[PDB]
Symmetry: none
Subunit: 74 residues, 12 copies
């Protein structure tokens, strides 16, 4: 006789308030990237990124994140 | 006699308020990317990215994220 | 006699409010990309991207995301 | 005697409000892309993209996403 | 005696409100794309894209997405 | 006779208030990156990044994060 | 008694020899040009050019030029 | 009694020899040009050029130039 | 009694020899140009150029130049 | 009694020999140029150039120059 | 009685010999240029250049220069 | 009685010999330039250059220079 009770309760708040998101300037100035290789062998769960010149401007009003994970292994 | 009860309760809030998302300038200035290779062998679940020059302007009013995962393995 | 009860309850909120999404300027300035290879062999679930010069302007009013996953393996 | 009860309940909200999505300018400035290869062999579930110069302006009023997955394997 | 009950309930809302989607300008400025290859062999479920110069302006009032998947494997 | 009771209760708050997010300038000035290799062999869960020149401007009004994990192994 | 003698002598040679003018490729890739103005006032000897996107391939076998000017002002 | 003698003698040579003018590739990749103004006033001998995106491939076999000027002012 | 003798003698040579003008590649990669002004006033002998994105490939077999100027002012 | 004798003699040589002008690669990678002004006033002999992004590949077999100037002021 | 004799003699040689002008690579990587001004006033003999991003590849087989100036002022 | 004799004699040689001009690589990596001003006033013989990001590859086989100046002032 094995009995399990699993009763999570969550009333959490992740909030934000901002009066004004103002002037934002992003001015990258170039660059050089050079990659040499001969053999690539990727297997199973592989995330890869080779030889990049990337520019990101991310301005979310808000941008709040909540991550929750529940596991019950028998 | 094995009994399992699984009763998650979630009343969470992920909110945001912004008065005004204003002027945003993204001005990249070029660049050079060079990649050399000979053999590529990707298997199973592979995410790959080779030789990129990418520019992203992401301005979400909001942009809130909630990620939840439930697992019950017997 | 094996009994399972699985009763998730979710009343969550993912909301956003923005007064005004204003002027946004994205002005990329070119670039060079060069990729050399000889043999490509992709198998199973492969996501690949080779030799790109991409520009993205993503301005969602809102843009809120909710991701939920339920699994019960017997 | 094996009994399973599976009763998800979801009253979630993913909403957004925006007063005005205003002037948005996307002005890319060209570029060079060059890819060389000899042999391509794609199998099973492959998503690939080779040699692209792409420009995207995505401005959804809203753009909220909800993704939910349920699985019960016996 | 194996009994399964499968009773998902979903009253979720994915909504959006926008006062005015205003002036949006997308002005790409050309480019060069060059791809060389010799042998292509695609099999099973392959999605491929080689040598593209694409411009997209996507402005949906709304654009909300809901994706739901149910599976019961015996 | 084994009995387990699992009753987490969470009423936590992760909030923020900001009067005005003002002028922010990001002006990178180029650079050189050079990587040489011969053999790459990635297996299992590998996250890799080789030869990058990346610029990020991240200005979230808000940006609060909550991460919670529950595990019950029998 | 004023006497002027003006006796230019010219036996000059401007020559050229070329064995073979071979393959020449000119492949422009588009572009954007935008000019705004309100009032234009051109007078006397004015040569002007506003808002052009021009492509020229000039391959003269030869192309030698000789310019000579003589003036005698009293 | 004023006497002037003016006896230029020129036996000069401007020559060239080339065995073979071979393969020449010109591949521009686009661009953006934007000029704003309000009032233009050009007078006398003015040569002007505003807002251009021009590509020139000039391959003269030869291309020799000789410029000579003679002046006698009294 | 004023006497002037003016007897230039020129037997000069400006020559060139080239066995083979070979493969030449010119591959520009775009760019951004932006000029703002309000009032322009050009007078007399003015050569001007405002807001240009120009690409030139000049390959003359030869290309020799001779410039000569003679002046006699009384 | 004023007497002038003016007898330049020139037997000069400006020559060149080249066996083979070989492979030359010019690959610019974009850029950003921005100029602001309010009032321009050019007079007399003015050569000006404002806001340019220019690429030049000049490969003359030869390219020899001779410049000579003679003046006699009384 | 004033007598002037002016007898330059020049048998000079400016020569060059090169067996082979080989592979030359010029790969610029972008950049940012920004100039602000309010009033420009150029007069007489002015050569000016404001706000440039220029790339030059100059490979003359030869390229010899001879500059000579003669003056006789009375 | 004033007598002047002016008899320059020049048999000079400026020569060069090179077996092979080989592989030359020029790879600039971007940069930032910013100039602010309010009033510019250029007069007489002015050579000026403001706010430049310039790249030069100059490979002349030869490149010999001879400069000679003669003056006789009375």
């Amino acid at each position: 006789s094995v009995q399990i009770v699993y009763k999570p309760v969550d009333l959490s708040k992740v909030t934000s308030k901002c009066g004004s998101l103002g002037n934002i300037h992003h001015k990258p100035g170039g660059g050089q990237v050079e990659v040499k290789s001969e053999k690539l062998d990727f297997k199973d769960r592989v995330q890869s990124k080779i030889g990049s010149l990337d520019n990101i401007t991310h301005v979310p009003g808000g941008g709040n994140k909540k991550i929750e994970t529940h596991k019950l292994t028998f």
